[PDB]
Design a protein around this nucleic acid. Sequence first.
RNA 1: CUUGGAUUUACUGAAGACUAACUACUGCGAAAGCAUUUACCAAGGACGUUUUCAUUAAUCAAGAACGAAAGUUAGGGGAUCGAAGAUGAUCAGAUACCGUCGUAGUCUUAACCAUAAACUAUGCCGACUAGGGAUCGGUUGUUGUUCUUUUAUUGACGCAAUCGGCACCUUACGAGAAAUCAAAGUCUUUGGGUUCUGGGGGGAGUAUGGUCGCAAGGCUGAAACUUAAAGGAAUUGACGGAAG
Lengths: 127, 98, 25, 214, 81
Amino acid sequence: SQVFGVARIFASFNDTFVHVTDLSGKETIARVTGGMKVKADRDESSPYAAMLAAQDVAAKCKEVGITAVHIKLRATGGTKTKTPGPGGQSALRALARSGLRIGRIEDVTPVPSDSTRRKGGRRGRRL
Amino acid sequence: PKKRASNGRNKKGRGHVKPVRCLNCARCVPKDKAIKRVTIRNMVEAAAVRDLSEASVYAEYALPKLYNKLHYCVSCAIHARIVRVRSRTDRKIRTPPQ
Amino acid sequence: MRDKWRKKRVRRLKRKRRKVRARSK
Amino acid sequence: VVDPFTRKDWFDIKAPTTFENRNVGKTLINRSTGLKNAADGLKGRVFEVCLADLQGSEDHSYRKIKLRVDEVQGKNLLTNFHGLDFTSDKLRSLVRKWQSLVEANVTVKTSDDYVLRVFAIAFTKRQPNQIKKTTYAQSSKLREVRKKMIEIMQREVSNCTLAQLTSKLIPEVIGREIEKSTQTIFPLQNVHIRKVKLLKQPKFDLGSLLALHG
Amino acid sequence: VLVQDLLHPSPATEAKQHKLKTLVQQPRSFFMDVKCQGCLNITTVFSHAQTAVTCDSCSTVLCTPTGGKAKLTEGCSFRRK
RNA sequence: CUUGGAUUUACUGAAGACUAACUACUGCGAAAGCAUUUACCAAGGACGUUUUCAUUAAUCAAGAACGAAAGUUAGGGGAUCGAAGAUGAUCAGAUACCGUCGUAGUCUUAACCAUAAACUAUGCCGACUAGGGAUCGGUUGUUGUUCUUUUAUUGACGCAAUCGGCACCUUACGAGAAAUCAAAGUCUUUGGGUUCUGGGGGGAGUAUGGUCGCAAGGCUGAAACUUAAAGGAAUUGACGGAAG
Ligand SMILES: NC[C@@H]1O[C@H](O[C@H]2[C@@H](O)[C@H](O[C@@H]3[C@@H](O)[C@H](N)C[C@H](N)[C@H]3O[C@H]3O[C@H](CO)[C@@H](O)[C@H](O)[C@H]3N)O[C@@H]2CO)[C@H](N)[C@@H](O)[C@@H]1O
Ligand SMILES: [Mg+2]
Ligand SMILES: [Mg+2]
Ligand SMILES: [Mg+2]
Ligand SMILES: [Mg+2]
Ligand SMILES: [Mg+2]
Ligand SMILES: [Mg+2]
Ligand SMILES: [Mg+2]
Ligand SMILES: [Mg+2]
Ligand SMILES: [Mg+2]
Ligand SMILES: [Mg+2]
Ligand SMILES: [Mg+2]
Ligand SMILES: [Mg+2]
Ligand SMILES: [Mg+2]
Ligand SMILES: [Mg+2]
Ligand SMILES: [Mg+2]
Ligand SMILES: [Mg+2]
Ligand SMILES: [Mg+2]
Ligand SMILES: [Mg+2]
Ligand SMILES: [Mg+2]
Ligand SMILES: [Mg+2]
Ligand SMILES: [Mg+2]
Ligand SMILES: [Mg+2]
Ligand SMILES: [Mg+2]
Ligand SMILES: [Mg+2]
Ligand SMILES: [Zn+2]
Ligand SMILES: [Zn+2]
């Protein structure tokens, strides 16, 4: 039917990555971050910047031949937060409303089997 | 004086319990003491579950859930309104809010 | 002052006296 | 300055005959030149595709297969089985509280000398008339269950080749027979082969692979 | 209940009590006559036996010890003396 | 830090840690503590016992074994975090809180140290005094239940008893200054056995002597002088850059 890439979306709390590869992931087709759409550091991870990022990502994809994508959402993971950033849901919604068709959706947040020590110290970050 | 009969934790018949880091501030908190919430949230907000389903290449594809278990220390949880200050008599109630 | 730090202060001062007493050893 | 997408050539990926819909999709690479062939730099790639797509049924939606390309025949990529894994959300949906989780793994080689590690998972099953909140199995029984898992993975892999074993995984023969073998030990649910890893491959035999492609 | 016949407990509730908590402690165990299926030979066996008792005629185990009462093997019938 | 391609993506490799989810008012251990699998080594409580010995015991100055973390000595390792140190911000000032690097340390092998809000702020042994429902381990009688395998001698679940545990709920015969307490009750109606500690607040765990330690320090431990209060629990109010 359609020709699938894989939209590997990394939505942290400081930025939002929209990166579409082939199925293998060794070939990158389009990579637009929320920081290429705004000039303020404070909203690099905003839903607005992620939606704009997906439209440019979506815009670049049609001219290469990608008509549909699979979604691999991840949060920062590791020792840091496992919840996705605010930009991951809007960039995903933008892709569906941009004419790209969506296949499988998966969370690929890296999750440790206990892991190494987390930054911040014993008492946490005191504010 | 003594504020709680459970000492604000869940350690009885035990010497030591391994710590956990608060999700929000990374403070070391004992596992029995940590305020724990298990969240199973829909991955797509209810506004967007329709248009992405129209855009789906699969007929009758069920959207996956987002599974997460969150750990908070006492300062973060009180601040984030996950738990609230209760009256002296209302503190004892330990059933989940309905 | 805090009891732990008041205690730390005397420890540094007890240590100094012992070193001071060592002169006449 | 160059639009590097002008130099890309598309190839079609074909899955092994163990699956139904062998037409997985399309990939690309820098076009083959005189200095560097596209073929040698194109082989060894691994694609992770949901098993439900490879079989049509949506019942296999929670398993994902790695297909590894090691031969190109014009614009077609002839792939082989590279591994098994569960989706993160499906695995997270089985690990509930008030039940016991039991896991086992074993390293075993197939008939054609494919060394694999297979990870098995199971949970205690709550009986229909049970009243108490939790369903915990005593630690001695879990040791017997873990041991029983291992001898089935060892037995059902070393007696067969990787291609037949791949055909064994789709209907979960090993997970259901392990469930059958532990009935007298403890009632179990969601007995799954949740992950398969290729560690070592035999010396490559193109003839054996072409037979797996028609 | 303030007034009660402590000297004459109801025998039903006396039997549910722990074996050391009756008026006079009395064991609840007993001795048995074991008929193996193979032959006919009276063999006296303790109910809570700690030994894999074997009958003299054939060196066949009559019972296997457990945490509590011994479990008689199949074909062996017991009658309490 | 980044057109010397950073961040990102897929595959592969190497190092050390750490054992997520399952994980609980659940288990074990003298305490400190203990959570991947399997093997081996020697332990252990409880239960069951118409086994055995017969007072062998309880608690214990002195004296022994163990004793989180940090710290010390000497090797090895040093991924991640990270005292010290350096820095970018903030501020009136900030040696800090926040951010970026980071050395000891964090790990391990041989030795040291012997301290924690080492807490249940609650000594141990023995007896008695009240109801209820859960739960872990063992033992003993019984099912409209599922399953081995088709059923038993499978296992699970369900229903009853019991002993031991980890706890929880109610009540107050009773205690207490109250908070509260099934022990913190059976204490002016004052005596079951036994070990330790305190005698208004400071000065002060200071000085001195002794002893242990490589050191840091540990154990033991005053006095002069000063003072009308210091303190506990609860009530009303006032206030809060806490919640509703
Ligand atoms: N009933 C509460 C307590 O039970 C204790 O004894 C109970 C236990 O010995 C035993 O309880 C078992 C327990 O071993 C294990 N966790 C399994 C089982 N769920 C528990 O038993 C439970 O069984 C059913 C409910 O399932 C009830 O009818 C029963 O009362 C309840 N105790 O059954 C006894 C029933 O009373 C003591 N009698 C006492 O501390 C107190 O009564
Ligand atoms: Mg604050
Ligand atoms: Mg207070
Ligand atoms: Mg204990
Ligand atoms: Mg402790
Ligand atoms: Mg003190
Ligand atoms: Mg684990
Ligand atoms: Mg347990
Ligand atoms: Mg025990
Ligand atoms: Mg130490
Ligand atoms: Mg150390
Ligand atoms: Mg290091
Ligand atoms: Mg760092
Ligand atoms: Mg500094
Ligand atoms: Mg002390
Ligand atoms: Mg404590
Ligand atoms: Mg105590
Ligand atoms: Mg108490
Ligand atoms: Mg003390
Ligand atoms: Mg029981
Ligand atoms: Mg109460
Ligand atoms: Mg008192
Ligand atoms: Mg005094
Ligand atoms: Mg003085
Ligand atoms: Mg007060
Ligand atoms: Zn916190
Ligand atoms: Zn016989």
